[PDB]
Amino acid sequence: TAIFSDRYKGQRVLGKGSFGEVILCKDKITGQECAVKVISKRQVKQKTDKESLLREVQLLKQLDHPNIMKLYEFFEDKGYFYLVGEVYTGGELFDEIISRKRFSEVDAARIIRQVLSGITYMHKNKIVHRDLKPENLLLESKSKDANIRIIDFGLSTHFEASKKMKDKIGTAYYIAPEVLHGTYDEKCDVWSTGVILYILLSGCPPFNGANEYDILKKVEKGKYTFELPQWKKVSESAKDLIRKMLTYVPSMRISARDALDHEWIQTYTKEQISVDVPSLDNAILNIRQFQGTQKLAQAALLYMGSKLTSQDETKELTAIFHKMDKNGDGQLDRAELIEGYKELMRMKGQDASMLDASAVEHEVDQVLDAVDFDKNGYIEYSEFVTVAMDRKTLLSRERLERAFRMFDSDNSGKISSTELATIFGVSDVDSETWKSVLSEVDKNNDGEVDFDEFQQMLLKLCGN
Ligand SMILES: CC(C)(C)n1nc(-c2ccc3ccccc3n2)c(C(N)=O)c1N
Predict the structure, then answer these.
(1) In which residues is Ca(2+) 1 bound (predicted)?
(2) Atom of ligand 1 nearest to the CA of 155
(3) Of the candidates 450, 435, 327, 458, which has an alpha carbon nearest to the alpha carbon of residue 380?
């Protein structure tokens, strides 16, 4: 057996995706950088058997297309799967789109042509994505002209998706109705693409509602419309492609390959001809609102989740250190701190950033440096615990504030109760529950909260 950490060292965390964390890693010999998705066997159940997973992996490694993330290697130990792929640095498509001041049907067609081209290739090799959405579209690099790379093609077949809301935010909008009912094939990827296109040209989901379940009720019915004012600025051709992608009965829905030949793709991807090409201003602003809402809901859930974890780990670490403290004096040396923190990791296993003993020792050392000023030999286990854990939550509280500021586009310092309803609907926190909480934070509020109040609401909503 090949051992992942014998070949790769973790450099830093890139982000969190479907099925687990993605870590930027480096080959210890060749210096090659790679993005490694680390799938925790305890958090993510397998749908297929080992034999079937190894065959898919072997096939995925041999496929190459400019719009599909490249998979290089695959490893498995006792606790995890490690999927080693190429690293891309351009970020999510929609986060790039919202930074633009101009965006036209030509831009949307360039985008969707890449996606269809990647999908067409994968379907020829009988691989289905199933969970296609804007988050799965990454830009190769931060350059303006960057290609799209679809991530996670094929994983849904072998791993069961999380039922935690923090993991399924913005999933409901894109799922094909046949996937909900159980009989699906590769045409589900065209539907998801169709939803994405609708969003690109209007900035609003064709199937929408106040919570995950209302969205699904709309998807399952299959009915949508083009009556938004900003569709008047959109070519008839584009709407026609959309109708064909969003056709309810999958045998009647256009194939990926045929969608590539559609008049709209043929017309608006000719690099020269701007026969009539206005900028879709309302769309871009709707997308910016959509995206800020999604990101703030997501950051709010991860904030709560991080706060629940830190309650768990603080108490567990303290009990581990307490038992290691044979003196009873409350002190421990470095190796013991390392030993208990590893004992924590052995139990916790939510920390893919700590891929080997080398990772642990350095985290401990960051904290021993952090104990303000240093006496070597006898360390107050109590303070190390506070600092180790504050460290763990940083990314998530800091991210929460950032996302609040980004959602507050007029810099008003506040979010309205109408806005709270939209955020909490997307986060799937019941309506009665969040108002009761507000009422307790600020008994006099007048339909808006500042950042501190919102944060206090989140703490109450996770039992603090
Ligand atoms: C941190 C975010 C933006 C969510 N991310 N995710 C990936 C990614 C996503 C899925 C992967 C599956 C197998 C191997 C590598 C994978 N890498 C990835 C990448 N490969 O560059 C990247 N930048």
Answers:
(1) 325, 327, 329, 331, 336
(2) 12
(3) 327
> Residues annotated in the binding site for Ca(2+), as ranges?
325, 327, 329, 331, 336, 372, 374, 376, 378, 380, 383, 408, 410, 412, 414, 419, 442, 444, 446, 448, 453
Q: What is the whole-number distance in angstroms between the Cα of residue 434 and the centre of ligand 1?
A: 34
Q: Report d(CA 309, CA 445) in Å as an integer.
A: 30
DSSP-based three-state secondary structure for 206: coil
DSSP letters for 288-338: HHHHHHHHHHHHHHHHHHHHHHHHHHHHHHHHHHHHH-SSSSSEE-HHHHH
71-76 and 331-332: which strand pairing? unpaired
| CATH code assigned to 90-152+161-289 | 1.10.510.10
| Residue tagged active-site, from 131, 152, 167, 189 | 131
Q: Is the minimum distance from the CB of 22 to ligand 1 under 6 angstroms?
A: yes
Which residues are part of a known binding site for ATP? 37
- Across 272-420, the runs of DSSP E, i.e. the strands, are 331-332, 379-380, 414-416
Pick from 300, 299, 295, 345: nearest CA to 320? 345
Q: Which atom of ligand 1 is nearest to the CA of 15?
A: 1
Let me know if 77 is a catalytic residue: no
* 311 touches 440 (CB < 8 A): no
Instruction: Say how many Å lie between the CA of residue 151 and the centre of ligand 1.
Output: 7
Pairing of strands 80-85, 148-150: unpaired
Q: Residue type at 318?
A: T
Resolution in A: 2.0
**Cα(257)–Cα(119) distance, rounded to whole angstroms?**
8
401/61 Cα distance (integer angstroms): 40
Q: Which of 23, 33, 34, 37 to mutate to test the pocket of ligand 1 (most atoms within 8 A of CB)?
A: 37
d(CA 375, CA 333): 10
Does residue 287 sit in helix, strand or coil?
Answer: helix
Three-state secondary structure call for residue 17: strand
Domain with CATH 3.30.200.20 in the chain: 1-89+153-160
CA pair distance 201, 239, nearest whole angstrom: 9
274, 106 Cβ separation under 8 angstroms: yes
DSSP string for residues in 78-124? SSEEEEEE----S-BHHHHHTT-S--BHHHHHHHHHHHHHHHHHHHH
Provide CATH 1.10.510.10 ranges for the chain. Answer: 90-152+161-289
- Cβ of 66 below 6 Å from ligand 1: no
Fold of 1-89+153-160: Phosphorylase Kinase; domain 1 (3.30.200)
